[PDB]
Symmetry: D2
Subunit: 253 residues, 4 copies
């Protein structure tokens, strides 16, 4: 069993990814802040007869991430795959104006928070697993971007900055780590039925479907399967790329 670390595993796309990798025979190491959801995931994988650990790790805390990787290596001796999927949102206009003045603007903290998890988290986790991958002459680095990182989107300064930034780091690490048997790719999901989207008002959802050529909101499973494909020992000639899984949706103006 190859070992795969999936961050943000306790919910949504990471939950699906975690499940898919386990069913495929990976030993899954699941990272998240959400401990109850974490244990629930493990219960789900045990019910499906898979092999996996859960660990409470903050991807944006260097000391937390370093300690987590050391424990994996001491227990299992290898990290084959890292999926950097942990994320957060705090949308809002740069400045929101009505009646001759600013009624709201994106809080400096809201900006910093989203960058810390969605950009800096990717850097920390990858930096931490890389030396092991190099020594093993193998690895798979898989980074969560977004369709929104390609086109931009209203109200998503911080989130777009992070997710376009993640594609950039993916291109760098592709170049640096190839010569060591490591590939580095990103995935850019469209609208996916995780909890945020499933809570959207009725009119907004059906417009989102109408704007999507294939005719639906995507499922976490769609992305999980995409990560599994990219992680294959047979996907050694795929590196430095961004695979869109967005039902053909392009974010109009």
């Amino acid at each position: 069993k190859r070992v795969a670390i999936i961050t943000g595993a306790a919910n949504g796309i990471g939950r699906a990814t975690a499940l898919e990798f386990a069913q495929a025979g990976y030993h899954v190491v699941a990272w998240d802040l959400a401990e109850e959801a974490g244990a629930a995931l493990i219960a789900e994988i045990a019910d499906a007869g898979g092999s996996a650990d859960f660990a409470r790790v903050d991807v944006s805390a260097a000391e937390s991430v370093e300690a987590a990787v050391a424990e994996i290596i001491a227990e299992h001796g290898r990290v084959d795959v890292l999926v950097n999927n942990a994320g957060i949102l705090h949308d809002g206009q740069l400045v929101k104006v009505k009646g001759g003045e600013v009624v709201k603007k994106m809080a400096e903290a809201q900006f910093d928070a989203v960058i810390s998890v969605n950009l800096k988290g990717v850097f920390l986790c990858t930096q931490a697993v890389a030396p092991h991958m190099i020594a093993a002459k193998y690895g798979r680095i898989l980074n969560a971007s977004s369709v929104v990182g390609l086109y931009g989107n209203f109200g998503q300064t911080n989130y777009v900055a992070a997710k376009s930034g993640v594609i950039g780091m993916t291109k760098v690490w592709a170049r640096e780590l190839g010569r060591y048997g490591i590939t580095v790719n990103a995935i850019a999901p469209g609208f996916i039925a995780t909890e945020m989207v499933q809570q959207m008002p009725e009119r907004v959802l059906e417009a989102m479907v109408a704007r999507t050529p294939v005719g639906r909101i995507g499922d976490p499973v769609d992305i999980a399967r995409a990560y599994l494909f990219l992680a294959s020992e047979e996907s050694g000639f795929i590196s430095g790329t961004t695979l869109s899984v967005d039902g053909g949706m392009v974010v109009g103006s």
Copy 2:
């Protein structure tokens, strides 16, 4: 069985993709100009326990394409998949000057021939199977682009025009056909050792590999499995995209 049309099936990437889809349990229809190699493909397929047909088809000839699609429908009733992989190269600088005179230039015919096969052939083939995919409310269209369609390349005015335009058409068709259960994607391969590439000077291949982060020339098999994955019934939320399989290679200037 699901039916997959693979154009340019007789050699290289087409041949591997044909062998690959039939092994996965598709019924393959192989189209190519090269009858001898086409027949041998079918033989190899049938010996391995697969099912396939070959037909001599010039993808650039509308009448040829239309008849061949009608034959398939008459025999098998369906077209689940089309891989538009057939292509040719005829490289050359736009213009080559010396002694104050043009001494060589990309001939009109050689511009036209690459356009005809690599661009127009993709249009004709897709256009012919499209109505059958619509009625069945299911389809997979898969188009052969190139890394060089992304970045451009010295000496390839014609090939790059075709391969960049193929991505354009991929985006249109995704828009037009998604409503009918059809996805439309492209693959853009990097350096892949087909016949011609295998016969390139050792020194040149070495420099090509040196420019490739994962550290080798690619194999037809790398591409074959990429189409297979995009062609999956479980890959229905991937559409309008360009999947790069280039080992991380970026064509620098």
Copy 3:
């Protein structure tokens, strides 16, 4: 006097560009199929104290292009700038299915004619001018692409193929011709108020503006001033790029 060839000069963007370049002090050579509007353009340029010639040229016809470049060399001894702006539209769905049958489809000739003018024509004009730019060790090649070359669009298989493909050739030629003092660039306009556009249903034009961030249809002079800038002898470090002038409009799906 620097000499600038403007193709499709009789109307729309081309007409504004010729007026613009002549006002800046270029000697303009206007190429178009439409002599009536062509000859009037020159009259107006002359009225304003500028310098310009008109020639009836089919940019898709190699002989007619070659002869016309020769005539310019014989008269003026030089070509400093070529603006490949000549274009045509013939839209339509790839196929249109009803009653279980194809009731309309993009005709082979529709596809071909747009490719011929919008892609081939750019190749022929650039090929014919290039040796003179090479001898002079100076040149500016400027290619008409479209916002729709970046994102694709419903109903535009042919137009998108050609415009995405024009960007591809722009990248090749930049690579081939830079060492001779020549830059090669493209512009991708959004919604611009030329003939057909100005005649579109008010309600449709209103929808198009609503999709445009800066809140209006563009004007041909928006484009003409962008070519002039790229054409500048002080724009010699811009090459291989695609300048978008689209008011921030992104063609949603």
Copy 4:
């Protein structure tokens, strides 16, 4: 006189941009940390008969930025243009290895410092001028990206993240601000002859020119001119775009 804020104005591209805007008749407010160099710039602009102020502003510090904008509005009543050109570099591999042993890795504070100036600072500055531009129904936001944000680059994890992220933020702001007469664009310079590049070894510089189609390193004035064009009151239909000024250079792997 329109008012333009140029950040990182004391050296390199910022200095040339400040001089170019002054010569165009803008009142320039130059921002930088480098005070002596700040005074010298003002003295240069005075010698050329222009109008300009210098202020010591750390773009990464919210309090400093908002105090600086408030002083501009109190003194001049308007901010027409912001060029966010300030930047820093701290290069190095994610993980540097020899002997299957890690000899260096990108320090966390190294990652954080570059993100702080090159990404967050852009967000702070724009956010600080934007309400005034909205009130006035006019504005030009112009963000410094890099060719490296397009293709990635060995040893530039932190810098590429920032510069690719800046492009993302550019796309968000285009969407949000267009309705108020405000445009938002990025420029992506190639290799430009500022101090760092100028200090490069002979052999590395040679190869850099060799790999640049137009045959030289760019000059800061190349980029100054491009910012000026994009900031023109006649460039109101240019928004949401990234103009490359890189001499046709594409960063090979």
